[PDB]
Write an enzyme that holds these catalytic residues in place. Structure first.
Site, PDB file in Angstrom:
ATOM      1  N   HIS A  68      63.651 -44.035  49.698  1.00  0.00           N
ATOM      2  CA  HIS A  68      62.362 -44.711  49.999  1.00  0.00           C
ATOM      3  C   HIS A  68      61.351 -44.470  48.882  1.00  0.00           C
ATOM      4  CE1 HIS A  68      64.091 -44.912  54.113  1.00  0.00           C
ATOM      5  NE2 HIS A  68      63.577 -46.150  53.972  1.00  0.00           N
ATOM      6  N   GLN A 269      78.426 -47.272  59.287  1.00  0.00           N
ATOM      7  CA  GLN A 269      78.094 -48.387  58.359  1.00  0.00           C
ATOM      8  C   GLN A 269      78.553 -49.718  58.973  1.00  0.00           C
ATOM      9  OE1 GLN A 269      75.594 -47.311  56.522  1.00  0.00           O
ATOM     10  NE2 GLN A 269      76.479 -48.289  54.713  1.00  0.00           N
TER      11      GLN A 269
HETATM   12  O1  LIG Z   1      74.045 -49.313  53.789  1.00  0.00           O
HETATM   13  C1  LIG Z   1      72.844 -49.261  53.944  1.00  0.00           C
HETATM   14  N1  LIG Z   1      71.986 -49.599  52.935  1.00  0.00           N
HETATM   15  C2  LIG Z   1      70.535 -49.574  53.111  1.00  0.00           C
HETATM   16  C3  LIG Z   1      70.063 -49.810  54.559  1.00  0.00           C
HETATM   17  C4  LIG Z   1      70.962 -49.116  55.533  1.00  0.00           C
HETATM   18  C5  LIG Z   1      72.279 -48.855  55.236  1.00  0.00           C
HETATM   19  N2  LIG Z   1      72.878 -48.221  56.302  1.00  0.00           N
HETATM   20  C6  LIG Z   1      71.935 -48.068  57.291  1.00  0.00           C
HETATM   21  C7  LIG Z   1      72.016 -47.527  58.562  1.00  0.00           C
HETATM   22 CL1  LIG Z   1      73.565 -46.863  59.072  1.00  0.00          CL
HETATM   23  C8  LIG Z   1      70.867 -47.509  59.378  1.00  0.00           C
HETATM   24  C9  LIG Z   1      69.632 -48.036  58.943  1.00  0.00           C
HETATM   25  C10 LIG Z   1      69.566 -48.594  57.675  1.00  0.00           C
HETATM   26 CL2  LIG Z   1      68.064 -49.267  57.090  1.00  0.00          CL
HETATM   27  C11 LIG Z   1      70.710 -48.621  56.831  1.00  0.00           C
HETATM   28 MG   LIG Z   2      59.840 -48.718  55.775  1.00  0.00          MG
HETATM   29 ZN   LIG Z   3      61.872 -50.272  52.826  1.00  0.00          ZN
END
Ligand SMILES: O=C1NCCc2c1[nH]c1c(Cl)ccc(Cl)c21
Ligand SMILES: [Mg+2]
Ligand SMILES: [Zn+2]
Length: 313
Positions: A68, A269
């Site tokens: 982030h 995932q």
């Molecule tokens: O593979 C990802 N890339 C970025 C975004 C993201 C990825 N996996 C996530 C899981 Cl398990 C929960 C919440 C987010 Cl925002 C997630």
């Molecule tokens: Mg945010």
């Molecule tokens: Zn963001």
């Protein structure tokens, strides 16, 4: 006035594509951002002296967290740039101005922790903002930086255009609260299928810009596999740190966030791709047909995660 930003040839070509990676040279990211504003908006949209002062203050207020961070801010802004460029006539001058800035500011001063960890910690921010805790803070930080002397990039707008743009940015930043995404997408699903979706309805625009924000925010799942796989590492570094801090509060974290249960990541995932990403990019492609490459790339990466589980890599 006549000072275009240009990019090297490879970047000039590749930046137009949804799956562009902004690369490992931090010092090029501000110019990549200004390049995108000048082509999305015009060389006139912002006083360049102010834009640049705004960008460097926004950059300073992102923290050194694994995911982030400042690179996320510019990565999400690039995705919004690609959507806007592939949908040229569907958006107002103010919306193009507002949304690129919303994306850049959308995670301002993120500490690497979920709204949920703030609430369990009893963080001051959770008393001040009961829902969309971090997202109300990110908007707050945006307004604070806009109010620094020399930083009001919107100065040339009228009183009411100004209020319009800050309202476009507040809705857009609030919409990156993934707890709001589910209902927003279901409503957009029904509206598209019953044929009621009407882009001249402001409340319908709001919903559609919200889905775009979710689509840009998650655009890490729409990159070429090597980029997606290495970015997943970064997001999990945050998830595990948060899992650790849950344990310190005397709370077993969901196994996704537990660094002792790394074996369960791939299935986690899969769930995320099936429950969130695929539906998000599916609904977005239905409403904005030229965003299809995001869906296709997301499907390719889902397929790559299926191979990870199967042990084929
Ligand atoms: O593979 C990802 N890339 C970025 C975004 C993201 C990825 N996996 C996530 C899981 Cl398990 C929960 C919440 C987010 Cl925002 C997630
Ligand atoms: Mg945010
Ligand atoms: Zn963001």
């Amino acid at each position: 006035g006549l000072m275009q930003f240009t990019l090297p040839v490879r970047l000039c070509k590749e930046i137009e594509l949804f799956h562009f990676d902004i690369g490992p040279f931090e010092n090029m990211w501000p110019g990549i951002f200004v390049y995108m504003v000048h082509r999305s908006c015009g060389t006139s949209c912002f006083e360049l002296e102010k834009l640049c002062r705004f960008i460097m203050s926004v950059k300073k207020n992102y923290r050194r967290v694994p995911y982030h961070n400042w690179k996320h801010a510019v990565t999400v802004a690039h995705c919004m740039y690609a959507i806007l460029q592939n949908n040229h006539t569907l958006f107002t001058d103010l919306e193009r101005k507002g949304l690129l800035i919303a994306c850049l500011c959308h995670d301002l001063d993120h500490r690497g922790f979920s709204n949920s960890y703030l609430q369990k910690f009893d963080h001051p921010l959770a008393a001040l903002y009961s829902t969309s805790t971090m997202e109300q803070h990110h908007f707050s930080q945006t307004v604070s930086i806009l109010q620094l002397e020399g930083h009001n990039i919107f100065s040339t707008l009228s009183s009411s255009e100004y209020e319009q743009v800050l309202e476009i940015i507040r809705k857009a930043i609030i919409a990156t609260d993934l707890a709001l995404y589910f209902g927003n997408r279901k409503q957009l699903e029904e509206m598209y299928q019953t044929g009621s979706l009407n882009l001249n309805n402001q409340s319908h625009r709001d919903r559609v810009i919200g889905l775009m924000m979710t689509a840009c925010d998650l655009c890490s799942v729409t990159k070429l596999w090597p980029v997606t796989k290495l970015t997943a590492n970064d997001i999990y570094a945050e998830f595990w740190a948060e899992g650790d801090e849950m344990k310190k509060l005397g709370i077993q974290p969901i196994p996704m966030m537990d660094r002792d249960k790394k074996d369960e990541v791939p299935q986690g995932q899969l769930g995320f791709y099936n429950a969130v990403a695929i539906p998000c990019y599916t609904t977005l492609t239905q409403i904005l047909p030229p965003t299809e490459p995001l869906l296709k790339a997301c499907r390719d990466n889902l397929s790559q995660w299926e191979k990870v589980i199967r042990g084929e890599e």
